[PDB]
Amino acid sequence: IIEIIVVCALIFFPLGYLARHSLRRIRDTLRLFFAKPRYVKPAGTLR
């Protein structure tokens, strides 16, 4: 009931705090995944 709701809130508050603390990591990973190069197009790593 109320106790479980408080427990879930206690779980999620530091969870969101850590998620915000890794904001740069999340942004970097998302940019790696989506991969939108608008103007700088890698031609290819040469040997």
Next chain:
Amino acid sequence: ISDIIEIIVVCALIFFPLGYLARHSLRRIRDTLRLFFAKPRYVKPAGTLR
């Protein structure tokens, strides 16, 4: 059962941006607290030596 799951989801949803704004505005909160009284310890002003 179903209502319990719904309420848990609702609480999680309300509390995620709660901590998001807690971290986002943490610097401003600390600054305001410093402004109010804080605790100006250690370094102490001696006087205005004119």
Next chain:
Amino acid sequence: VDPVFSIGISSLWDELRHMPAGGVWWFNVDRHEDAISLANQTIASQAETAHVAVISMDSDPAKIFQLDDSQGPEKIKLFSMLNHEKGLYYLTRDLQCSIDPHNYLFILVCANNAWQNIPAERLRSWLDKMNKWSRLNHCSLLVINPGNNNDKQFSLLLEEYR
């Protein structure tokens, strides 16, 4: 911990040659062919484990940038950008989407008089952003600009010595 990179000049003292990771160094050349030769020599003079990449303009980098078969890193990343201000502005985000800049080197060989159309205030803001990004990512950036009327640009670079 972060290794230091070397400029491609033979018989040069390490005081003017060594470059720590996490900063920006600017190089101007009288001729674009001098820029290409210097870029190739810098590529050939780096360590095997060094992460170095080249970005050029108005050409295909695969045919104008080479490596020494006896010295230099095993492989480098080649990147091509449009000859426009937006390419330079987005460079940071594009490389972040492409390469993890930690312990990694940029060599930006621009076209002839490529930095002539960039306004002063925007150039200062871009340089500040590049320096902050270099410090944050511990990445080093080198820019080679073939130009003849960059005296005002040189003065601007002097003013942003910080």
